[PDB]
């Protein structure tokens, strides 16, 4: 967006030496055909389990049974002949 | 940040011009580089696993 100089005005570009055509041309870099080398194996002997773990730890418990259940010798109260 | 690649640039040289030059005097270069060389199969799983 340059302002026109009246008084000295300029053209367009004159030519100049240049820097040997084929030489500003690239070849197009020819790829061959490859591999991921080798024979993969199936698993891998992890440094980590792969499983969830727990943040904390719940008791767990299991049933008893008691015991066979006796009779008993009872002190007995004295019988009610109006005093109590 | 750009690397030399003549695809992107056409040819490209690297340039000394010595002030000195002793006997026996050589200019010992170093590079450091990617080159891709496409591939078709990213296979060889044992099928009977």
């Known amino acids: 967006m340059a302002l026109i100089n009246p008084q000295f005005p300029y053209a367009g570009p004159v030519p100049i030496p240049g820097p040997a055509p084929t030489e ?3 070849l197009l870099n020819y790829r061959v055909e490859g591999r991921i080398a080798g ?11 792969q499983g969830p773990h727990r943040e904390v730890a719940e008791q767990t418990y299991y049933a008893i049974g008691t015991g066979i259940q006796m009779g008993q010798t009872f002190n007995q109260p004295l019988i009610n002949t109006q005093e109590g | 940040d750009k690397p030399i690649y003549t695809l992107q640039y056409g040819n490209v040289g690297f340039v000394v011009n010595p002030k000195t030059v002793n006997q026996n005097a050589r200019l010992l270069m ?6 891709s ?4 199969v990213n296979a060889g799983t044992i099928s009977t696993t």
């Open chain 1, 24 to 26: 500003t041309m690239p």
């Open chain 1, 39 to 49: 024979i993969q194996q199936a698993r891998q002997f992890m440094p980590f389990l």
């Open chain 2, 30 to 35: 170093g590079y450091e580089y990617f080159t």
């Open chain 2, 37 to 40: 060389r496409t591939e078709l």
